[PDB]
Amino acid sequence: VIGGNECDINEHRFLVAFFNTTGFFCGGTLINPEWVVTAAHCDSTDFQMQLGVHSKKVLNEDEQTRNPKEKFICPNKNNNEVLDKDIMLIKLDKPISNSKHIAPLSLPSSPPSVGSVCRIMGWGSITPVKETFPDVPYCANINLLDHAVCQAGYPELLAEYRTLCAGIVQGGKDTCGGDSGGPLICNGQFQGIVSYGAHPCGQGPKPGIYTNVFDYTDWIQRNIAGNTDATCPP
Numbered sequence: 001v002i003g004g005n006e007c008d009i010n011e012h013r014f015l016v017a018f019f020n021t022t023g024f025f026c027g028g029t030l031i032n033p034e035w036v037v038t039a040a041h042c043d044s045t046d047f048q049m050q051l052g053v054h055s056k057k058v059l060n061e062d063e064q065t066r067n068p069k070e071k072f073i074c075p076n077k078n079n080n081e082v083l084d085k086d087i088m089l090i091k092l093d094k095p096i097s098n099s100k101h102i103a104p105l106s107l108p109s110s111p112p113s114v115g116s117v118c119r120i121m122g123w124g125s126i127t128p129v130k131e132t133f134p135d136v137p138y139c140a141n142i143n144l145l146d147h148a149v150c151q152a153g154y155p156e157l158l159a160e161y162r163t164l165c166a167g168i169v170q171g172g173k174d175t176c177g178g179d180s181g182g183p184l185i186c187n188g189q190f191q192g193i194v195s196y197g198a199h200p201c202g203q204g205p206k207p208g209i210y211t212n213v214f215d216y217t218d219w220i221q222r223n224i225a226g227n228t229d230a231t232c233p234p
């Protein structure tokens with residue numbers, strides 16, 4: 001995250017860190033005791049999740065480690081299009097209980113509104129060109145922009161992809177390398193998933209692209225109910 005500051009230690013209880021033995025590589029959102037939502041492109045053959053984390057060096061007392069018991073991506077997703085249905089559901093190998101630094105964030109109940117103020121967060125790079133990874137997660141506020149802005153900046157962004165466009169018109173505040181999979185929270189609602197962006201990060205003509213969570217809520221709920229055979233909207 002660039003153009004921001006260190007997050008408050010209590011404002012990201014739902015933030016999940018994805019890591020392997022090399023380090024953190026993605027973020028995720030705890031939506032209930034046994035489920036985490038992240039980006040499909042954050043999938044890997046071997047990884048674990050750390051909950052209740054703030055600083056990588058100073059352990060939080062209630063920090064928990066979890067493994068992916070089951071993973072779900074849209075059955076009708078085209079694997080050759082990284083921007084097509086970039087969302088993945090993960091069932092934990094063991095449920096977690098609410099604690100000082102751990103609590104779920106509910107699925108959105110209302111669609112995103114252009115012009116709303118949104119917050120981004122993650123352990124991604126805090127510098128635009130060079131890669132500088134912080135020990136603590138950084139936070140920043142940005143605006144939900146008209147989809148036309150991203151359309152003009154990204155020739156690869158097709159109209160059929162269910163995405164949201166966010167940042168500020170002049171650039172300078174944006175997600176960066178390593179923030180993928182994290183939540184985009186607008187008006188207190190989990191509205192998007194960090195999905196795609198450009199490098200250098202924070203270019204005015206190239207705002208961040210986030211997966212529209214609202215559109216996948218029904219699919220998500222059916223998988224949680226036990227209908228892991230459900231398909232995503234075209």
Ligand SMILES: *[C@@H]1O[C@H](CO[C@@H]2O[C@@H](C)[C@@H](O)[C@@H](O)[C@@H]2O)[C@@H](O[C@@H]2O[C@H](CO)[C@@H](O)[C@H](O)[C@H]2NC(C)=O)[C@H](O)[C@H]1NC(C)=O
Pocket residue numbers: 020021022023025026041042043044045046180
């Ligand atoms: C730990 O994971 C990192 C990153 O994994 C990749 O990126 C994730 C977002 C997700 O898409 C995964 O499926 C990817 O594999 C690995 O680091 C990458 O390693 C490759 C080659 O080894 C390198 O080209 C990339 O630049 C690295 N990171 C980036 C920028 O993506 C790392 O190898 C994994 N550690 C182990 C031991 O498995």
